[model samples]
Target: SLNITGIQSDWKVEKIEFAKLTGERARSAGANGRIGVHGKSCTVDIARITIDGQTGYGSSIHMTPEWAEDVIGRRLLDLFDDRGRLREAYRLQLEYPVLDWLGQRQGKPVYDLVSGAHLETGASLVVPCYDTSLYFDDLHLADERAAVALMQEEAMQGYAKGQRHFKIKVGRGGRHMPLWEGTKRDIAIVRGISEVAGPAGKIMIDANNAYNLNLTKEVLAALSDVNLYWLEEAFHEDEALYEDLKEWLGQRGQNVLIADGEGLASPHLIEWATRGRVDVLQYDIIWPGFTHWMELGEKLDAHGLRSAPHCYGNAYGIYASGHLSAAVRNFEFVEYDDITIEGMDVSGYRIENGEIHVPATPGFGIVFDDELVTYLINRSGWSEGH
Candidate 1:
């Protein structure tokens, strides 16, 4: 690992748009019950780090130039210990870029640096990925058929792009629509996706904390024909409620797992996992940050709980989460947000049959647009040392 001498850190804004629609349609109507219309694109905050003559990237919603100056002389290996736990001083700071630099410096992939796994030559690293673009875009259509077909087409678009897993946002009646109408619409859309996805495809749904215990059970019961993989945020993380849902599923032998913790998650939720109430943890990779996930993922793995960190609205989270799987044992799937931005070429990362094939290339296998780099730097980016 290179000794840190000087540091250069900068932030950039990447526009993330939905792959399910194009043009004005894409911009006009994206919604998921409580959140209302999601509009055209989400701006993801990105952090770029330069150290030892190489560049690394990560999702950093906030960073300051003073931070760049603070750890200028620290060693890279010193930041992360033998167990791969990030030291307290470096917790939740630049681990993404640091891992990127380590991969590039050693001529290895980020996963190798974290996991110590020697990926065989001529082979590839693969992880299951789910297309998460099936939002409530068709809510404007009066006909349920049209609404269902719209999302089904969106899932197909993802299917053509090698997506085999689909996650549809349910809870239409949660706040956006009437209870009866919205619930029916939610049921129809999920089943419609199943009808289109066929047996080879895996399906999941997110309620975004929209349902009560009975309503969640109602929705699942309605979709009995579909082999739903998991349900996310169907309701808030209440121990009693989750245990009720768990026992309900047990009595019926339904395999649908509970997932939550994307936003507003608490420590008690983690505690619930040990007893088998929560099968999957859905914490956002950006908030706890990458290195934090290194520690959390291990804990989740120890309990045999699946880690599927939230990447619903952020594009970089998808790529960063992929590297995370290298170190995490029970990583479930990448909650893929289908979007694109200029100057960011992740062609090295490929999606085939719904699995993301992480390249063994240095630095997350990303070759960012250099011209954009210059533009960002000239446009208020900061550099502290040579």
Candidate 2:
């Protein structure tokens, strides 16, 4: 067991276009969205230290270098106990055989080549066409031009590749200051996407549950007629809301699928699944890692609920989520973002016909750019002793 005694962090901003993203989709949700606290990145860095040598890695956006360093440092310490017991404990519970076997085969295709309702159109149902999923975040509204530019970028480069499912960030009820404005602008942007993507394209919007039941109900009611795929995160995290929503969605049959659970860590997923808290079971790999995610996926599989792994971080984290999604059942789609391609080689892994193709290459099939490493260091002020 290694005793982790120290950590370090740093901050940097991305100055790249969405089209340039070639690596994993780490640019999703909070990472490189047009809006968020960090502007276009997570704004934090994380590192860990052992008694012998400094063994760790780093990443972040909008966060200040000091705050990022402190928070991630503290988190690393928490994950491991004295004498590194927790780290060892996590390893011993490894279910390698399950992964090993799953990794070897392409696995079975759950979705038919076409959906019966939308079948004759012959339109493709791409499983994962990565996007930032930072729906109508208030922070984005402040930079409306930037947000529009980002949306245009996605429309130009991503839309052509069947990258249509957009998860718009919205949590503030129609009352939050900036998000309220952001929501309106985002709706216009969605209309633009609809024009660009045509009737076949899908748009999944998220509210991040910043509203009480009445506010959520009002918002969902207003949005009821819109062709929104999922009215995500509309209500606060509560089982009764989930129960209430189940009946609500049943009436529409398919108007909107209740999408939630990005806040769900593994233990919470158990309570959520048992209680049927969501129609879309979205989980994050960076937050809980694959060990617990696989368990949650298994439970979702048993119930026929669609599971979407929330990839809301950098490329490595995105890779973790992608691999987990590959092994899951009823995965509606995985959160895709372009942050990885800003400075990474995400070749071999392409979204063809809507399904994400896992690269046969070793280790998540990602090749980091050395030049980018230098960029990270120079931009974020990462140093050896720090």
Candidate 3:
């Protein structure tokens, strides 16, 4: 038993620093037109927590140095409870730093540290994932065949990169075109992707809440031949509508699940799942923070629910979510947006045959380039820590 003490009291937080992590997408991404285009690069914040000769870093989930003013030279255990869990008050601030510190001290990866109590059946390090960058890239084309050709080619690139799943953006009619034409394009592109993705391919769609129950039903009916994984944010989180959609899918013999909880989520999604709705809960991987997901995972496990934490634009989020498969049995998939943060070492993980193999290396197995850290801190972005 590791006990309640986080580690030897000798280990104390020494240095904490912040910097910007900028990553670019392989292609510009387009949504239902409401959120418009996501071109090239995305920059997010990172925090490096240092102890004597060692360092642990992860995504900076929140801002405000005033929060870390008292955290400077304290023992890492100062953030833990009797269960050796990170305290709720500092979870947003120290979850990553603490976990990374704890992981390094134990000579174990963060996944092993978090999944210890729940490792009855042997945790999984290889995580199933999906390419989420298949935006309405085809929307630029007027020819239906051309649209499918362009989008399917993009899907092939991800497949060639070793991912076996693809999630395409739908709801073009909401912003880009007429409902009828947009809906027709959505159907054509989905099936078109399947042709090149091989039989092992799994397809999922996200409408970004640009849909009604009827519209969802229509699109799904047309995608009957495609091996659909789950429908994400088809129409936001509506209990009545979702329950109704599930009923229809069941009766229609469609195995597609209802996935939501990404943005502007209803506070009742977890509760609704208990009543035989919401097969997947997709709260963003970094929003409420990983600590929240660990707490929520236990509850979802109690009710036999599933999770696929949305990590779209957050570059580090893709790698962070993979380590979670070791801790939560309720976790189902990691959303990959083809993001790459410059000057960061992500060699610890790789995608192959539809799964991301998370490294067993200590912490999140990520190393931020020291020089790049200084450059970004003074330039791209930064917040004070110590």
Candidate 4:
């Protein structure tokens, strides 16, 4: 969608292996990781696409295999057909595996392969990570005291691990509410998180588009004193609304940056960034692939904005996202989901003191445990057509 019409689709889906990881394997390393369905039970869809007799692998365990394939078949192929080239929209979930395969062939890391020709320097081998703790579960489902205690505990864990930046979920009301009725609770959650993070720590909030403009403005006004790093996706994304909020925030001289762009599709992202809508742009490598993310990184840099990727899926995907962060100059931090796997050999790749050193190895530095993968694959929903 970024106007590349000459690139060709060099690969096609060859085989797909779907796997489910659950039970003890489904648990998160930290309580903060318990917010998402992946922490309870998750699926992994592995795509084996081939190009020129070489195979490229893509995966999406967070979503169903049928859905992933449908997206590729319906949306991605259309982009390929219309543009006669590959863009970020052309391969949402397939971005990493394709890039991994390409990087493997090129004998370089995916980040290097992406930026080497365009930039004078190589990618960073280490990128700072923001601790992902405190979500809807920590707030909505627990009493205020219990929730605050959990937040404090998570903050202590992250601080002990050397992380100074943290992100938490807000806007807890169910969808379809006329107004974001959870303003008071949302405010309380922020207060709890703030106490835990301390004045020296940076805190970010993701509302996931649950607030309308009035509610958003109300919350922003209240958070003026919170020293928030950014407020992400407070309301549904509309260019006019964002521009209006930007103008309003500027008039107020508020330092709380507005961050969004995760759920946005291709052309919309281009328009959003080019128009200078939000202060911080967040995109995931899972959607629009790594190649597209590189293009976006350049665009964001040109627009004088920083980019932070949203990565809260599988462990392998986190590794891939980290590699991309290492490559982007405008990148500030990457989201680190405190999810762990038992007996997985993550020796050199563990998050230390809030930073994850990019694997020096090629292709995301992932070594699949064949035995485990086989077990999950057998347990896949597709295995019984669930």
1-386 per-residue lDDT for model 1 (tens digits): 22233222222211111111111222233788578877656555556666555666655554566666666655554565555555656545576666676667668777766662433444568988998878888878889989998888888888888888988999989988889899999999999999889987788999988899999989999997797999999988988889999999999998898888888886799888888789999888877777778778888877889999898566677898998887788899988876665556778888898899898788677766656655765565655553
Local distance difference test scores for all models: 0.75, 0.48, 0.79, 0.61
Report the Cα lDDT for candidate 2: 0.48
The predicted structure with the larger lDDT, 1 or 2, is 1
RMSD of each: 5.3, 11.3, 2.2, 6.4
1 or 4: which has the higher lDDT?
1
Q: TM-scores of the models, in the given order?
A: 0.89, 0.60, 0.93, 0.73
Give the alpha carbon lDDT tens digit for every residue of 70-95 in model 2.
43323333444465323433222222
> Tens digit of lDDT per residue, candidate 3, span 167-188?
8888887777788899889889
lDDT of 4 by residue, 1-386 (tens): 22223223554444445554432332233222113332444334554444444555455434456554554423223434243235434356455555556655556665555443333345447777887755555534436667667666766777776677788776765342213445566677778778777786788888777777887788888878776888888776778888888899889998777787776543575577577787677776566445667667776777888888776655555667776764467787878765555323445576665678776555666655656755766665342111
Ranked by TM-score from best down, the candidates are 3, 1, 4, 2
Candidate 4 weakest ten by summed lDDT: 25-34
- Which runs in model 3 stand beyond 4 Å of their true positions? 1-6, 116-124, 378-386
Q: Which number leads on TM-score? A: 3
Q: After superposing candidate 2 on the true structure, give the runs of residues whose Cα lies further than 4 Å from its correct spot.
A: 1-36, 41-127, 133-157, 171-192, 224-226, 264-269, 341-344, 369-386
Q: How many backbone clashes does candidate 1 have?
A: 0
lDDT of 1 at 345: 72
